[PDB]
Design a protein around this ligand. Structure first.
Ligand SMILES: CCCCCCCCCCCCCC(=O)O[C@H](COC(=O)CCCCCCCCCC)COP(=O)(O)OCC[N+](C)(C)C
Lengths: 108, 60, 97, 57
């Protein structure tokens, strides 16, 4: 069961990546936005200390929220929403990705 | 006076032997839109009115 | 509570100072009195009431000076410059070439 | 009721503990490795293939 769904999903995903040269750029950005959050929590687990807690929480929020806006751009960029073009999803990505950096520079 | 002297304001006329610290005990937003309407009527539209009349006629 | 000590004196008076002391960890209103009630001598008092503020929101050690949050500043600058190199390298490429 | 009274003082609180600086230099070094790994990996594959350059007016 899971072998068939596994190899089916690997092949049907890798063909989709090799078709469009926009998708591997998104996913290459995404994976290293996961590794930033992982080692940034590893600093907390390594030495037991919790003192500048807001400065901990700001970078972690940058990693998670910045991951999510990429996944929304990917979902909206493969299949188009009814009424929204592909020139407007990108501008909304710029504006809403540009508010979040300011409110995570005030917070540290 | 300024907006910088309001966000961190220690008043010693309430709970007297141990005064309260306001900036971490109240909700700003009802005051600062009112000071904004006062600052817009006084400097731009041309007509100066008192702060008490902006505070009374703020709900209707 | 702490005992005053002799200081430089003029022709008719005699001055006493307390050097320097560091104010308390608690904020509020404080009063500063030094009375001299002694039997045989006269009675003298003097006092006043002053207010001791908490810290402001600007007077704090910043995020440079702690050396415990260099890691997170380095985990903000990378996402900023990686983001701008993302956006410039997105409108200068092709589709299914 | 009218003699001398003993002098006292105050007892502060201990400051929060800072961590020693020869660890934070190591971790900002690791971040400076990972970001350059990201830029090298973009320029390695077909992703950053600068080919629709908008020259003209
Ligand atoms: C898509 C993004 C959209 C962002 C929308 C931003 C809209 C905010 C516009 C605010 C304009 C303020 C203009 C202004 O300066 O008026 C002031 C100050 O007036 C005030 O007290 C109210 C302003 C407080 C600003 C609150 C922080 C910013 C919140 C929005 C980012 C009058 O207050 P006063 O009490 O008279 O004095 C203030 C201090 N001075 C230095 C000026 C002396």
């Amino acid at each position: 069961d899971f072998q068939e769904t596994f190899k089916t999903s690997k092949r049907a995903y890798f063909a989709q990546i090799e078709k469009y040269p926009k998708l591997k750029l998104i996913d290459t950005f995404c994976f290293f936005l996961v590794l930033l959050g992982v080692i940034q929590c590893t600093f907390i687990i390594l030495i037991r200390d919790n003192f500048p807690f807001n400065a901990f929480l700001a970078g972690f929020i940058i990693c998670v929220g910045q991951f999510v806006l990429l996944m929304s751009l990917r979902l909206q960029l493969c299949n188009s929403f009814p009424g929204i073009s592909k020139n407007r999803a990108f501008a909304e990505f710029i504006v809403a990705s540009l508010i979040l950096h300011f409110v995570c520079l005030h917070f540290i | 006076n300024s907006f910088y002297k309001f966000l961190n304001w220690f008043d010693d006329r309430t709970w007297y032997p141990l005064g309260r610290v306001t900036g971490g005990t109240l909700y700003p937003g009802l005051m600062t839109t009112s000071a904004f309407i006062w600052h817009a009527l006084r400097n731009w539209l041309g007509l100066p009115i008192d702060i008490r009349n902006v505070c009374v006629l703020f709900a209707p | 509570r702490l005992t005053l000590s002799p200081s430089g004196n003029d022709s008719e008076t005699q001055y006493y100072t307390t050097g320097e002391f560091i104010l308390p960890d608690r904020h509020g209103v404080f009063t500063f009195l030094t009375d001299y009630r002694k039997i045989g001598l006269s009675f003298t008092t003097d006092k006043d009431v002053k207010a001791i503020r908490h810290l402001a929101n600007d007077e704090y050690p910043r995020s440079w000076e702690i050396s415990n949050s260099w890691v997170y500043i380095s985990a903000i600058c990378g996402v900023i410059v990686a983001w701008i190199f993302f956006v410039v390298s997105f409108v200068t490429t092709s589709s299914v070439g | 009721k009218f003699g001398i009274k003993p002098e006292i003082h105050h007892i502060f609180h201990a400051e929060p503990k800072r961590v020693a600086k020869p660890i934070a230099v190591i971790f900002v070094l690791i971040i400076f490795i990972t970001i350059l790994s990201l830029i090298v990996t973009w320029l390695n594959s077909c992703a950053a293939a600068f080919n629709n350059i908008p020259t003209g007016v």
